[PDB]
Design a protein around this ligand. Structure first.
Ligand code: CLA
Ligand code: CLA
Ligand code: CLA
Ligand code: CLA
Ligand code: CLA
Ligand code: CLA
Ligand code: CLA
Ligand code: CLA
Ligand SMILES: CCCCCCCCCCCCCCCC(=O)OC[C@H](COP(=O)(O)OC[C@@H](O)CO)OC(=O)CCCCCCCCCCCCCCC
Ligand SMILES: CC1=C(C/C=C(\C)CCC[C@H](C)CCC[C@H](C)CCCC(C)C)C(=O)c2ccccc2C1=O
Ligand code: SF4
Ligand code: SF4
Lengths: 30, 81, 61, 75, 142, 146, 293, 146, 75
């Protein structure tokens, strides 16, 4: 049970939010 | 200032570096410390691409024009786009 | 007519701050829901082997 | 990539998703068509010729010399 | 000091069929360069971006995207055809800046009155070792 | 550049200049919903017919789920660009000059508010397009090669 | 828990596999080790190490997980804490090369080795003789039936009296002697590893060397060498080594890249040393017959 | 050369075939035939057109090791100046393609620096060199568990 | 070029060359395995490099020894 939820979260979601979070921070300008 | 170009006192005023700058950085100014009575000078270091050919034609003991590569700008990187 | 019908029925999805939150959070919930409630007959892992295990060499070690 | 996908599917125990003759198929038809033409050329489009210009055309028969195959149609 | 620069006009460019080596979006945003030269005879030369175009009589004008390109042609013209040339820099807003001879005289020979920016009056072996410049904005050569 | 037949011709210059990305004089919300319609209805095929469930009777509902997600991911990849390439109060970066030289309006799409409208158009159209394929292909489903 | 019951016929298990690309014949193939789904067989040899050092069920491991998780939480606090003002050390604190070498030699290397000896003879050795000792009850049990005496009197010659017999079964009481510190040097016949009672002695022996080696340098109490002085004094007469080691104190004590270089060189060697000794003198039970490990 | 030596000497010992090392280990073909070629028979059959085994994952990683390692050469041999001229053509094509001149890089694209390529090239070489051997070491030994 | 001369060597041994029975049945050199094993990258390792390098590797002590040495020497 529990793997079927935690494997996608660290494999799909947690990467996506990570990549999209950095991309804004890297590409900022002030 | 993008790259730093420095010319020392060994220079014998041969005008071989100036003629070999492909983007017109270095230039020649009067001196009194050589038989030729002229020493090179680098008053336009912005456009300096970093192509060390400027100092592959300085014929002295070690060298009299020296090039230190610093940060890169959009012209010091020779970007056409 | 298509202008007005489309213009009002896509307004909620337009503010980029809100669209970014709902996409990830809602989507991340949906990925969770689909795998936690997929049939075992379409995901081989989700069903067990249900078959006898083959022993390794040198006994079972 | 098709080689890599083939290898990945085979490694995961899915030999019915590989690219092969026994699975998802990729048949070269254009080469198979031109092979057909040269096999029937001795019939019409080259009446002088007794046989095809070779034996690797998609039709004919092998040539055996001293218990060693010379050639036969290459599928 | 007799240094009034050339003050670029708008003249006719050379005949050319156009190529893929011309300007890019960099011209519309950052900068692009023009190099105005005058010929006595309508001949054919080779463009820095490949291909050959024919210069026409008198005041030409031609735009290139870098400074290495303006000079690379600038050497060819001054060498092969014994012909004068300047070049400029053009900004997006429209302000144009005089560049090449910078005094009216090529930098190869000496004008009494230019500056000495960027010189160390000591041999190269006398630079300071990197421990003497640590935690400062200085460098050995500076 | 160069003027070749491909880069300039009446047929070419009329095809491109009349599809949503270039109709510079209509609201970017619709220009997003057309784009999402054509793309969404497009990619429902290969997911449904070539996916890992094509043999199973859920091939219809496993392709559609696949296409729906891909539209969602591109919607994120759209928003990341809009939020990182425009500022909330900065004007448009589109060229305002036509080939003839008439100075036209800058495209509203090249604008933070416009692009955020455009992605709202794309996302809603993307899912709407990908259901419209599923309805047709498994209700009004006779002639097709599926 | 199962692997313990027969170490030579149960593949140690690392974790479970949940990969939704797996087809069906792979799910079967990777189901092994007496599990219910796919698993990975552990080749890092943790299973033997935790057997030797006394762990015996799952439950010891869970608290083992929590504790280390807590220790990690504690460290993250410290990395934040020592950045605020009024908690950051000054320069002179880091550059104190003497007071650091006393603590590291005497406290870090020293006491830890003494305390690991404590665990070996309060949990580990009792585990290998059938005695289950835990934080609940470790006050009742005696490491040696006359414990804490024979050491005070001076006749330490009793803790090596009656060691484990040759015919010993690692997890039970058959042939289980009562000696806690020994010097045998051979192998445990059944498990092909070093004896437990040697390893307890050795960590006790080198628990002393570092403690006594820890009081060399002078910190605040007017005794002990000055490392600056030792470097200066060793200047060979005859000049063959020039001014010798003069001035190397500051050069090392001011160059981080120097200190790191030395640390790596020493760490680089002993890791090769660790590799060379482990495979010849297996220090964990039932690890010389798991060939892959 | 160190780990090779440890593995083969022990892998002959564990089988009780200590003569095989003591003779083959004096000529190079002995190391190539009797250690590499011979002991990899079970590894490469991790998956074939007949079936798969537990060893498939190690068979896959084995090739995956060969692939990264062979990508390493690309950065060590081919140096920067070639790729930089290749990007410029590409950064021209993207600037003239319709529907794709609407997306603009925020950070201009340039080829990796000279030192970076060396570092990157060595990263692949090392990773591929560890994974390759680590797969062969575990699979070959665990295949026989002896 | 190298893959071309690999493609030729395996295709001909597996599909064309080989002895021939007196009865008439033909048995190719590698048993006709090209059509199934050449689609996976691991296939090119097992059945071509690994299985057809046997002759060169164990060519010591007979007239084919000079190839055994060159094989190494070229590495
Ligand atoms: C840093 C060490 C470490 C490593 C390398 C892993 C690695 C793994 N864990 Mg894990 N885990 C760890 C610490 C670690 N864990 C700790 C400390 C906890 C306690 C909270 C967990 C709790 C945990 C659960 C509950 C599950 C995994 C799972 C997994 C596997 C899938 C990755 C995943 O979703 O994990 C996510 C990791 C975290 C949320 C911990 C981040 C802190 C993977 C083998 C899954 C699994 O077994 O897949 C089959 C699974 O179901 N882990
Ligand atoms: C690391 C995490 C992770 C996880 C959890 C998954 C999970 C999945 N992948 Mg996937 N993948 C990953 C990483 C991951 N992938 C990476 C890194 C790659 C690049 C190599 C791929 C490349 C890949 C391909 C090429 C495909 C998958 C597919 C799939 C699906 C399995 C097939 C199936 O039964 O779908 C059943 C479910 C559906 C068909 C509907 C999708 C449900 C959505 C996701 C909700 C499943 C959603 C297959 C798939 O489904 O795509 C259509 C597929 O074709 N993946
Ligand atoms: C550089 C490598 C290379 C290249 C470029 C080709 C190219 C070709 N081979 Mg080929 N071949 C190669 C290596 C190569 N092969 C090797 C190494 C072998 C193993 C011996 C073969 C064995 C082989 C056979 C057995 C046959 C070919 C044929 C062909 C042609 C197919 C004609 C076709 O369908 O188009 C036609 C296209 C149209 C009609 C429309 C467009 C094509 C030109 C076939 C052929 O054309 O026979 C004459 C054929 O029968 N090849
Ligand atoms: C376009 C393909 C093609 C090619 C390469 C050839 C090739 C050849 N033909 Mg030919 N032929 C073709 C189509 C072709 N034919 C067609 C479509 C017809 C109409 C039926 C003919 C009718 C024809 C005749 C009647 C004769 C040839 C002959 C020949 C040979 C001289 C030569 C081998 C001559 C021959 O037999 O050569 C020995 C000959 O007498 N051809
Ligand atoms: C792997 C590639 C692939 C596959 C399997 C399909 C499969 C399919 N497409 Mg599709 N399509 C594709 C690529 C693909 N498409 C591409 C690249 C385009 C370019 C825009 C299109 C544009 C397209 C249109 C415009 C339509 C289809 C339609 C269809 C369906 C009917 C096919 C038919 O009658 O012929 C079928 C499910 C038809 C449909 O209604 O889909 C259900 C339809 O109207 N396709
Ligand atoms: C008994 C006392 C003791 C103990 C157990 C340790 C133990 C440790 N110290 Mg340490 N340390 C000590 C006293 C001690 N130190 C004293 C007195 C000083 C001041 C001179 C330092 C200064 C010090 C520094 C500067 C560093 C350590 C570090 C470390 C860790 C490696 C290790 C846990 C290192 C570490 O990992 O930091 C957490 C590290 O960088 N220590
Ligand atoms: C730093 C390590 C360490 C620590 C904290 C302790 C702590 C303790 N030991 Mg101990 N012990 C240690 C190392 C250690 N020992 C070693 C290395 C030996 C081997 C000689 C012993 C042998 C030993 C005996 C024989 C006895 C203790 C006892 C005790 C307890 C009471 C001490 C008064 C106390 C819990 C006494 C007790 O009552 O504990 C159960 C006791 O009888 N220990
Ligand atoms: C070298 C030191 C050392 C080490 C590494 C271990 C290791 C272990 N012991 Mg142990 N033990 C030791 C000495 C040691 N022992 C000594 C000297 C004694 C005699 C008193 C015991 C008595 C003992 C018993 C009775 C039990 C263990 C158990 C265990 C295991 C579980 C640990 C646990 O539950 O944590 C929990 C630990 C505690 C609650 C006490 C914490 C003590 C202090 C706070 C540790 C200080 C660390 C320090 C703060 C680090 C700072 C880091 C900072 C610089 C970042 C583990 C294998 C258990 C076991 O075998 O399985 C269940 C068990 O039941 N030990
Ligand atoms: C680490 C590995 C490298 C360092 C270990 C070796 C250290 C140097 C070994 C020779 C150290 C060394 O040579 O020093 C020995 C001696 C130098 O003595 P010192 O200078 O230290 O002091 C002695 C006199 O100088 C004053 O009484 O030289 C001689 O006596 C001459 C005869 C040499 C011939 C005999 C030795 C031949 C070898
Ligand atoms: C391919 C190649 C490139 C091209 C590589 C580029 C332009 C960057 C790589 C392209 C993208 C970024 C691929 C990234 C994929 C990785 C998984 C990213 C991980 C971080 C160089 O720039 C180069 C420079 C000097 C010597 C050799 C080479 C060289 O071999
Ligand atoms: S590096 Fe090039 S640009 Fe710079 S001074 Fe030298 S020659 Fe001129
Ligand atoms: S090349 Fe050297 S010596 Fe000659 S002018 Fe330049 S700096 Fe002086």
């Amino acid at each position: 049970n529990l793997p079927s939820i935690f494997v996608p979260l660290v494999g799909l979601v947690f990467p996506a939010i990570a990549m999209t979070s950095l991309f804004l921070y890297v590409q900022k300008k002030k | 200032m993008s790259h730093s170009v420095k010319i020392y006192d060994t220079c014998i005023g041969c005008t071989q570096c100036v003629r070999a700058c492909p983007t017109d950085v270095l230039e020649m100014i009067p001196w009194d410390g050589c038989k030729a009575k002229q020493i090179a000078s680098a008053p336009r270091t912005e456009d300096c691409v970093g192509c060390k050919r400027c100092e592959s034609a300085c014929p002295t003991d070690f060298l009299s024009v020296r090039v230190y590569l610093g940060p890169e700008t959009t012209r010091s990187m020779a970007l056409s786009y | 007519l298509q202008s007005k019908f489309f213009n009002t029925f896509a307004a909620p999805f337009t503010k980029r701050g809100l669209l970014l939150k709902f996409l990830l959070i809602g989507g991340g919930s949906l990925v969770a829901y689909v795998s936690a409630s997929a049939s075992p007959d379409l995901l081989p892992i989700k069903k067990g082997p249900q078959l006898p295990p083959t022993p390794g060499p040198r006994g079972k070690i | 990539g098709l080689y890599i996908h083939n290898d990945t599917m085979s490694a995961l125990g899915r030999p019915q998703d590989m690219f092969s003759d026994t699975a998802i198929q990729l048949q070269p038809i254009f080469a198979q068509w031109v092979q057909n033409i040269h096999a029937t050329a001795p019939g019409v489009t080259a009446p002088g010729a007794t046989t095809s210009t070779s034996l690797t055309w998609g039709g004919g028969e092998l040539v055996a010399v001293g218990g060693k195959v010379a050639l036969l149609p290459i599928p | 000091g007799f240094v009034p620069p050339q003050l670029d006009p708008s003249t006719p460019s050379p005949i050319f069929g156009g190529s893929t080596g011309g300007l890019l979006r960099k011209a519309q945003v950052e900068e692009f360069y023009v190099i105005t030269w005058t010929s006595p005879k309508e001949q054919v030369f080779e463009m820095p971006t490949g291909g050959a175009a024919i210069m026409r009589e008198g005041p030409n004008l031609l735009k290139l995207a870098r400074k290495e390109q303006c000079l690379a042609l600038g050497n060819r013209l001054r060498s092969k055809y014994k012909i004068a040339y300047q070049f400029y820099r053009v900004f997006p807003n429209g302000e144009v800046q005089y560049l090449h001879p910078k005094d009216g005289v090529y930098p190869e020979k000496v004008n009494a009155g230019r500056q000495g920016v960027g010189q160390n009056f000591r041999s190269i072996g006398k630079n300071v070792s990197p421990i003497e410049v640590k935690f400062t904005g200085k460098n050995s050569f500076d | 550049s160069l003027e070749t037949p491909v880069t300039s011709s009446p047929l070419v210059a009329w095809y491109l200049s009349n599809l949503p990305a270039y109709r510079t004089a209509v609201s970017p919300l619709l220009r997003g919903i057309e784009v999402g319609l054509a793309h969404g209805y497009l990619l429902v095929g290969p997911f449904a017919l070539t996916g890992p469930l094509r043999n199973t009777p859920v091939h219809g509902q496993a392709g559609t789920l696949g296409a729906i997600g891909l539209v969602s991911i591109l919607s994120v990849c759209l928003t990341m660009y809009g939020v990182a390439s425009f500022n909330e109060g900065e004007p448009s970066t589109a060229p305002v000059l036509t080939l003839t030289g008439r100075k036209k309006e800058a495209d509203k799409l090249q604008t933070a508010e416009g692009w955020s409208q455009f992605t709202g158009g794309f996302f809603f159209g993307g899912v709407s397009g990908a259901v419209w394929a599923y309805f047709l292909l498994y209700v009004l489903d006779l002639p097709y090669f599926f | 828990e199962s692997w313990i019951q027969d170490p030579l016929h149960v593949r140690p298990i690392a974790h479970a596999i949940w990969d939704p690309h797996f087809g069906q014949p792979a799910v079967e193939a990777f189901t092994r080790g007496g599990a219910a789904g796919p698993v990975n067989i552990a080749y890092s040899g943790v299973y033997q190490w935790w057997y030797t050092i006394g762990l015996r069920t799952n439950e010891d491991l869970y608290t083992g997980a929590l504790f280390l998780l807590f220790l990690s939480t504690l460290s993250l606090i410290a990395s934040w804490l020592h950045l605020q003002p009024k908690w950051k050390p000054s320069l002179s604190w880091f550059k104190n090369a003497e007071s650091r070498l006393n603590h590291h030699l005497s406290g870090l290397f020293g006491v830890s080795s003494l305390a690991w000896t404590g665990h070996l003879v309060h949990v580990a050795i009792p585990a290998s003789r059938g005695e289950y000792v835990r934080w609940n009850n470790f006050l009742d049990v005696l490491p040696y039936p006359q414990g804490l005496g024979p050491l005070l009197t001076g006749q330490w010659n009793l803790y090596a009296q009656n060691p484990d017999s040759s015919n010993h079964l690692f997890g039970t009481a058959q042939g289980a002697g009562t000696a806690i510190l020994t010097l045998l040097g051979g192998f445990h016949p059944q498990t092909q590893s070093l004896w437990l009672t040697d390893m307890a002695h050795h960590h006790l022996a080198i628990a002393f060397i570092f403690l006594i080696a820890g009081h060399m340098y002078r910190t605040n109490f007017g005794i002990g060498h000055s490392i600056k002085d030792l470097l200066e004094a060793h200047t060979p007469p005859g000049g063959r080594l020039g001014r010798g080691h003069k001035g190397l104190y500051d050069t090392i004590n001011n160059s981080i890249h120097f200190q790191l270089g030395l640390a790596l060189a020493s760490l680089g060697v002993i890791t090769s040393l660790v590799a060379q000794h482990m495979y010849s003198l297996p220090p964990y039970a039932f690890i010389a017959q798991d060939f892959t490990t | 050369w160190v780990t090779f030596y440890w593995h083969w000497k022990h892998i002959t010992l564990w089988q009780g075939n200590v003569s095989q090392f003591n003779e083959s280990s004096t000529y190079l073909m002995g190391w190539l035939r009797d250690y590499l070629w011979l002991n990899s028979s079970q590894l490469i059959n991790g998956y074939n057109p007949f079936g798969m085994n537990s060893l498939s994952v190690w068979a896959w990683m084995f090739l995956f090791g060969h692939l990264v390692w062979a990508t390493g050469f690309m950065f060590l041999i081919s140096w920067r100046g070639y790729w930089q001229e290749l990007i410029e053509t590409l950064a021209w094509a993207h600037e003239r393609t319709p529907l794709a001149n609407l997306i603009r890089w925020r950070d201009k694209p340039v080829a990796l620096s000279i030192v970076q390529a060396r570092l990157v090239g060595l990263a692949h070489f090392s990773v591929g060199y560890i994974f390759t051997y680590a797969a062969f070491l575990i699979a070959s030994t665990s295949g026989k568990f002896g | 070029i190298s893959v071309v001369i690999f493609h030729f060597s395996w295709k001909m041994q597996s599909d064309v060359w080989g002895t021939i029975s007196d009865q008439g049945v033909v048995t190719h050199i590698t048993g006709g395995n090209f059509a199934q094993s050449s689609i996976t990258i691991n296939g090119w390792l097992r059945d071509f490099l690994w299985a057809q390098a046997s002759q060169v590797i164990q060519s010591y002590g007979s007239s084919l020894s000079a190839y055994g040495l060159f094989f190494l020497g070229a590495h």
